[PDB]
């Protein structure tokens, strides 16, 4: 926790943010794989 | 009878007007209501009223207008052990009982067929 707090201080990502839909990392991977595949 | 195009809306929604200069200065205060007639429109009081007795009473009235609905009404008001006609489903207990009592009844159908097929002749 201490080291994490110290360190604290992609088109699919933007499109989903426009619809203010919470997106998980797993979903982003599948969509990217779906396009490339 | 004539119904027009399902896609098209009434011409009122499509018909528009535009402004120009000069403009009338008068700002309308109220809507004109020369004749007191508001027929064929339901009251807006019936907006956010919770479920009550009028729901099952009006349901029977409309159900009794159909042949299949008349059977539901007679069976519900006679062959259902409920302390009220305001039916509220919060559990699937009564629903699972009726399924296990039915889907299970059709067991042994295949084993029964095996009896006939296997009792026909002896392999030996």
């Amino acid at each position: 926790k201490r080291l994490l707090e110290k360190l604290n201080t992609l088109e699919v990502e933007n499109i989903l943010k426009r619809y203010h839909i919470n997106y998980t990392q797993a979903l982003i991977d599948e969509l990217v794989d779906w396009k490339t595949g | 009878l004539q119904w027009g195009s399902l896609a098209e809306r009434p011409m009122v929604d499509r018909v528009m007007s535009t402004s120009t200069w000069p403009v009338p200065y008068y700002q309308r205060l109220f809507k004109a209501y020369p004749i007191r007639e508001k027929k064929d429109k339901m009251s807006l009081l019936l907006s956010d009223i919770d479920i009550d007795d009028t729901n099952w009473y009006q349901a029977k009235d409309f159900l009794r207008g159909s042949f299949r609905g008349r059977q539901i009404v007679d069976y519900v008001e006679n062959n259902i052990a409920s302390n009220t006609y305001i039916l509220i489903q919060q559990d699937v207990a009564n629903m699972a009982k009726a399924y296990v009592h039915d889907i299970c009844g059709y067991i042994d159908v295949a084993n029964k067929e095996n009896v006939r097929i296997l009792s026909k002749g002896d392999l030996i």
Binding site: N14, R18, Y19, H20 | S5, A7, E8, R9, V12, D13, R14, V15, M16, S17, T18, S19, T20, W21, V23, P24, Y25, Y26, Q27, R28, F30, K31, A32
Partner: protein, 365 residues
Amino acid sequence: SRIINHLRGDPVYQDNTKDVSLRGTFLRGKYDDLPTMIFFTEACDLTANWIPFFTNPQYDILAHRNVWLLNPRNFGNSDRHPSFDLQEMSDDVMRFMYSQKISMATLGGHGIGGKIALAVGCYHAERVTGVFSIDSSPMDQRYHEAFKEFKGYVNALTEINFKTWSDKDVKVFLKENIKDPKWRSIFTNNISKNAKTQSDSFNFEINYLNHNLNFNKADSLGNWAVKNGIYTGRAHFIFPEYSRWVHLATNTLPMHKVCARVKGFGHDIFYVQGDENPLNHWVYDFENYANVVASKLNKFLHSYDGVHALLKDRTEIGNFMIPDRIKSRNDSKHIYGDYSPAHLHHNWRFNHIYEKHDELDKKLN
């Protein structure tokens, strides 16, 4: 695919302000024939961000009208010209409406976009049915704190040189120079890489824009000049309760001062109940703000937009008769009396619906 259709083109720098073409996204409506809506996004802001608002089944705005999400000159994909005169920028829309065969349209805008929408109604009122302005007012905003930041950020963006600066040098520049999260995100997405990755640049003309804002004179976008005149048609204003752009205390008077038909608060001017938050300008992000704007928007399009001035609502079309001024008609043997004003089809010029219905009427008789 089908519902979403945005024509594709390349911006062209133009020396003549009349040879300017506008480009934007078009959202097709559910029904066959519907009037059109032209919506202007915030300056330097993406049109795509407004798609979920106009394409939400809960709101169902497309059920009422077809939407043209259009970019003004020097913004987005539209052509580029150093002048920002609202009279010139208004004629651009009129040519777009002509090239697209649009007789008259509903105009909308967000922030400075609201100004652009109202200017068209001020310069071309006979072809505008109504105006719906969101968090904007026909007012001089040069000295509003919200405008200064935007005016300040645009000036900082002129320091970056994409040729020499690397991708990381840019990201560091924005975070430090741009504090507002939304403006920062808007500007990042406005950066684009031309074909052959020659170099990255902003979609909007940073040079022409900064001069308009930095000069901070009548032609500035924050300013609203007396030259723009008066809007004669239907106008509805919706803004947050606590908004940095439109203050409820005095920034409502310009609406009465510029819009002749504006009745007042509670009829054509509303405020959305909300807290103090600098991000409330972007209503489409917060459901609470958007739900009220949509309901008020659907109400303006359904009952108030494109309705004659002296009529209360669309319900009065065909049942309320307007008084006539004496000696207003060419016919001399005319008994002057009350009449219901004529409301025409939204694209009666580029179609033959009147010629067609005239024939059908004869068949009856």
